[PDB]
Design an enzyme around this catalytic site. Structure first.
Site, mmCIF file in Angstrom:
data_model
loop_
_atom_site.group_PDB
_atom_site.id
_atom_site.type_symbol
_atom_site.label_atom_id
_atom_site.label_comp_id
_atom_site.label_asym_id
_atom_site.label_seq_id
_atom_site.Cartn_x
_atom_site.Cartn_y
_atom_site.Cartn_z
ATOM 1 N N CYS B 10 46.472 -15.882 12.345
ATOM 2 C CA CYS B 10 47.708 -15.130 12.503
ATOM 3 C C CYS B 10 47.573 -13.780 11.812
ATOM 4 O O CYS B 10 47.867 -12.740 12.401
ATOM 5 C CB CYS B 10 48.898 -15.906 11.943
ATOM 6 S SG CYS B 10 50.471 -15.021 12.053
ATOM 7 N N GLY B 496 29.508 -36.774 -11.035
ATOM 8 C CA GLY B 496 30.554 -35.829 -11.372
ATOM 9 C C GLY B 496 31.901 -36.480 -11.136
ATOM 10 O O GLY B 496 32.013 -37.395 -10.320
ATOM 11 N N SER B 498 34.259 -34.876 -9.884
ATOM 12 C CA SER B 498 34.666 -34.240 -8.637
ATOM 13 C C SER B 498 33.721 -34.615 -7.500
ATOM 14 O O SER B 498 32.618 -34.075 -7.399
ATOM 15 C CB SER B 498 34.718 -32.720 -8.805
ATOM 16 O OG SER B 498 35.219 -32.095 -7.635
#
Lengths: 701, 699
Positions: B10, B496, B498
């Site tokens: 957009c 980890g 994460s």
């Protein structure tokens, strides 16, 4: 007959058809429920058990190629393995000579013969026989009665359309007589003034006609879409009040497609029932007038309408078939597209990009072939009807000429007739073209109707389980005998290697399903007597698989309970340990979150689910292996939540992590669908019965 | 204001519009990749980086309320937050008086007042200005030229259709003079024999017309569907060879919808060129004959065609708009429906069924409003054009009568004209109704065209990572710095908190992405220089999210490598510990699994992914936390897999389960996107630096 709406039900359709030929016409949805129609399909055991449940004596036997039995019990149910789809079962009705005509429930009766049939059968056969009751099947009620009931309150408007149609067509005839006065009087006798005036008059008439058609078309559109909305709404509302078993039985695509389709078709049918009463009288009036203008020419016109009708009626059924085929194939194309894209990564890693490419080439090719079939059928129709119409016109003008020079009529009368044909043949063309729509309308009417028929619900502390058995579907029970006892306000644990049954117990407590034999009791009373609306709110379930609907978070957290004070909500938000990820949002609390978007993480999501369970204020909290989603933050937030709980309300923990469950108060063990022994880690490990074996195998290296 | 194809782009359309109106016309796809268009959307910082990449010197600054600065730099791009969706960005071109003219990217330019503007605006502004280079954008070539190129082998077929059409319409005129001969000679002079013979003849003419139109229509149909197939296939093939960033960028629905829809819409234009070349000539011939038949009546007819054209052309643009609205609304409805259904259980437990019920009802209601709008537009069009046509006919007949009694023509000739009208007005009606189709066809041509433009790839042992940073998108980087060293022929470990980054390293290792800064090295050569095919074949990944395409297991197991011996597949099956449940199947190995059905269990699925990873024979094997997904089958299969590895090739283990991964030879730690210390469980835990704290959290 009997045609199958979807693919999940087919054996249900086979049994439906066989019952239909034995005198039992029953709702195919209820047959889905009797066969235990899975998403996979309807099991053979489902067909046989449904037959037995209806009282029928049926035999499910492996078959030999070629058995070719002389005293073979008809009809028989044969399974087909390699038929584009896996849930495909076909009924055997007629085996004569060397040709086994198979009656396929996909609206077909083919003659594959034993050559192709023995090439494409599982060899699983189900011989079916009648056993006393019921032996009658008038149960399937007509739904279009109810939908015409939806047509009833609009009577003022439909009357308006009726009247407007009447006047429009009258003015139409009046305006159609212009040519007669034109050629016979105005041009032959040369009257300029009368010519001008008459021209003006008929022009005005036409303008009145269009100014009628304007509001008529507006009205019929409005009526139509209102019927659409009403029907759709009833379906949706009734499937929302619907129990869980049907939701497990069918996929999303099913209910969502059929809802929309059946709505449009039913509305088309009711705007068409509007068309019947008007085009009938207009065709009658026009036919009479045509007859008065010229008997023989009306006879000719009638022959034309007849030929048209013949061509259309003879072309209807195959076109519907090619249509269904186009739908199915194009659907498979779209699905293969989506799945190929979803697995773009792995299919990239394999290097077989060329493989799925050739695949989609073939899919496109087959869809093209089916498309060419239907298109060929349509151009055949258009060409034949076009022949009939055109030659019809030439003939009418020819015979008209004959009657003119014979001295029976004027050229202007002929031309006026050439203008009135449009007011006799158009109504009957519509009235005969009406039949195909009605069939599809019946199909759709049943499609939404059967689900409109299905029952809602209802009808149809310390926590203990007593002799409670449970199976999800028509198969081996997941839970056999179950004996349990849980203390109020104490953290207990449910452990089994089968997470299916372990979570099944929790699902059963929420009363989404009922115990097969015996009953389950909470705080001295059975679940069967308890109100479902209270069970929903007072018990909270933390899912392994968290779901998030599109919208603002501030709204999504407080579904169910409206107008909840922010002081109550913010403590739960803070307690979910997601609060840090809550304040980080662009729009604070009201950030647009659409379909796990824009940037939603699994951990924060599960934390949010926990926040919901907290905001629900549970008297009983059941937790699946939610911790497994995001380990460390889950440890922190679990410590935080266990601290918050304060053991004020009953809390149940389903987990595989033995190290996590040992700290808990008491533990239960699920083995082979039966509860073994209740206790704690110390006593159970010292029991040496089986838990010590479990710990020995856990520490087995 | 430039209309947006999809929703992911957009702001890209905004910069596209400003740059295009400033002399820079570039493929909007390239503007998506420059803006780093995410599935989420295009970031503001993405807009700024796109400005810098396009050469613009721009400053994106927060704005206040009614600053109304006299020297406000035009154009500027301001974002609006409310009230329908979060991905809304708007171009500001003209702000004068008390009318805030917003250039809406939904193919619109409104002058919505400051009441509504300030009711739903963020006030976030990006001042955009040209800064030195370049500025030029001739890249946007007409795609319909290349698509017109596909007609080349079919030139014979189009010639056949052309000829058949020509003859058909000629026969049409010939047959149209029938009424003339009817009324002027046969009825007036009373000749029966001549009447019968003549009628039979013209009947024959009509039949010849039908037997021509038959094969004509068949031919044009065949042409159409062949072009469809060709276009769709080329698109799909090129999007299969397409890099990953766009797959992350766009949703499945996006690429697929644009695939089928834009393909067919584009196909319509090549049938349209047929209509142009044939109906031009036929409208010319018919128009000439009509003109010779009667000058004034032909002038009238021309006025009619003119009025038709006027009404249609003035009605065109809004109909397309209402079409867009119906599309958007119906889409939102379907989405709310599916989403409502998927969460049936949770919505049962919550008790707010009536909530989502009223919600979807309101959605249905607005869809009704838009639908009714478009219907209204259509009935207006039909009524007006119907007026022009009807009144046109009555007038032509009356004035024709006038010319008859004037002595200029006969009644039968008038009727011949009234029957010949259909061969002048029909060709021009099609030719003018053609324009709306061509517009949508150009739009679609761009829709599939921009993705047809994006480049493929290429272009665009011991394993060690040196100062390698990586960020997926224009946002906080997943890897700020990565330093690692992996031993050949040894089972290593990746740990980890994460999992995103943990999987990121492995995915980057598979060379699906290039390191932003620094390079990744394998066995003495950088991954960028290694052949991506060899990287593809030599590396197998066992995913946390396993994918299975519909088909037989015997094939699905062996995707990628063709002509693989069944002994290897059955050995891989035996090693995957799934073989027992594989032979348990009804049709052994060749059971249809569509789609990953019918009754497939998660454990068996991950086992099959492992079996596939086994069949590739990896020199480097990457494994995600497959064990963490499904506990019991992981316990059974872990012993079998540790037994199976045999330490012949390098194997990497990604897991969060600290208790499980320590048995491996060496372990690496990922913290906040940065590596702490490389070593073994003993050395790291005894290090007491931070891994020991992690172990304290493990207890």
């Amino acid at each position: 007959c009997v045609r199958q709406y979807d693919l999940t039900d087919c054996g249900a359709a086979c049994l439906s058809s066989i019952a239909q030929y034995y005198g039992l016409k029953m709702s195919l949805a209820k047959i889905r429920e009797m066969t235990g129609t899975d998403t996979q399909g309807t099991n053979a055991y489902g067909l046989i058990h449904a037959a037995k449940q209806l009282g029928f004596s049926a035999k499910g036997v492996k078959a030999s190629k070629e058995d070719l039995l002389k005293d073979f019990r008809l009809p028989a149910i044969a399974n087909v393995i390699v038929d584009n789809r896996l849930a495909h079962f076909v009924v055997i009705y007629s085996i004569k000579n060397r040709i086994i005509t198979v009656a396929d429930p996909g609206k077909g009766i083919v003659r594959y013969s034993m050559d192709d049939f023995c090439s494409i059968w599982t060899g699983g056969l189900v011989l079916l026989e009648p056993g006393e009751a019921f032996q009658k099947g008038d149960y399937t009620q007509n739904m279009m009665v109810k939908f015409a009931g939806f047509l009833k309150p609009l009577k003022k408007t439909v009357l308006c359309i009726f009247l407007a149609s009447l006047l429009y067509t009258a003015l139409g005839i009046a305006g159609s007589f212009y040519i007669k006065f034109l050629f016979d009087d105005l041009i032959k006798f040369e009257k300029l003034n009368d010519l001008h005036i008459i021209s003006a008059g008929f022009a005005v008439i036409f303008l009145l006609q269009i100014f009628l058609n304007y509001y008529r078309s507006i009205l019929v559109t409005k009526l139509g879409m209102s019927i659409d909305k009403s029907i759709m709404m009833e379906y949706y509302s009734h499937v929302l009040k619907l129990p869980m078993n049907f939701f497990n039985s069918r996929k999303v695509g099913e209910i969502i497609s059929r809802f929309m389709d059946a709505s449009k078709i039913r509305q088309a049918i009711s705007g068409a029932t509007l068309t019947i009463m008007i085009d009938t009288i207009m065709a009658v009036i026009g036919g009479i007038l045509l007859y008065i203008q010229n008997s023989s020419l009306f006879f000719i016109s009638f022959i034309i309408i007849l030929l048209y009708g013949i061509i259309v009626t003879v072309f209807n059924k195959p076109i519907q078939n090619a249509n269904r085929q186009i739908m199915e194939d194009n659907a498979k194309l779209t699905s293969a597209l989506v799945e190929s894209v979803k697995g773009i990564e792995t299919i990239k890693s394999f290097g077989a990009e060329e493989q799925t490419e050739k695949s989609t080439r073939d899919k496109i090719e087959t869809v093209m072939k089916s498309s060419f079939k239907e298109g060929m059928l349509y151009i055949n129709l258009s060409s034949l009807t076009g022949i009939v119409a055109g030659l019809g016109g030439i003939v009418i003008l020819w015979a008209g000429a004959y009657n003119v020079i014979k001295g029976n009529m004027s050229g202007g009368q002929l031309l006026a007739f050439n203008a009135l044909l449009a007011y006799f043949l158009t109504p009957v063309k519509n009235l005969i073209d009406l039949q195909p729509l009605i069939q599809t309308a019946v199909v759709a009417s049943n499609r939404l109707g059967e689900i409109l028929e299905l029952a809602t619900e209802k009808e149809l502390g310390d926590i203990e389980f007593r002799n409670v058995d449970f199976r999800y579907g028509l198969r081996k029970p997941v839970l056999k005998n179950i004996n349990l006892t849980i203390p109020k306000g104490k953290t207990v644990a449910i452990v089994g290697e089968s997470g299916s049954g372990k979570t099944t117990l929790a699902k059963l407590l929420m009363n989404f399903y009922s115990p097969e034999k015996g009953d389950i009791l909470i705080n001295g009373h059975s679940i069967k007597n308890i109100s479902l609306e209270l069970i929903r709110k007072k018990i909270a379930f933390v899912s392994q698989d968290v779901f998030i609907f599109s919208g603002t978070v501030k709204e999504n957290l407080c579904l169910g309970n409206e107008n909840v004070d922010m002081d109550e909500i913010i403590k739960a938000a803070k307690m979910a340990n997601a609060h840090d990820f809550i304040e980080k949002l662009p729009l604070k609390y009201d950030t647009f979150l659409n379909e796990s978007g824009a940037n939603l993480s699994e951990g924060q999501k599960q934390r949010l689910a926990i926040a919901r369970a907290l905001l629900k204020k549970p008297d009983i909290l059941i937790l699946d292996e939610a911790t497994s989603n995001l380990d460390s933050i889950t440890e922190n937030h679990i410590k935080d939540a266990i601290y918050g709980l304060e053991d004020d309300v009953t809390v149940i923990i389903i987990a595989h992590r033995l190290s996590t469950i040992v700290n808990c108060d008491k533990i239960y063990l699920l083995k082979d669908g039966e509860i073994v022994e209740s206790g704690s880690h110390t006593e159970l490990i010292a029991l040496k019965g089986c838990y010590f074996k479990m710990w020995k195998q856990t520490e087995n290296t």
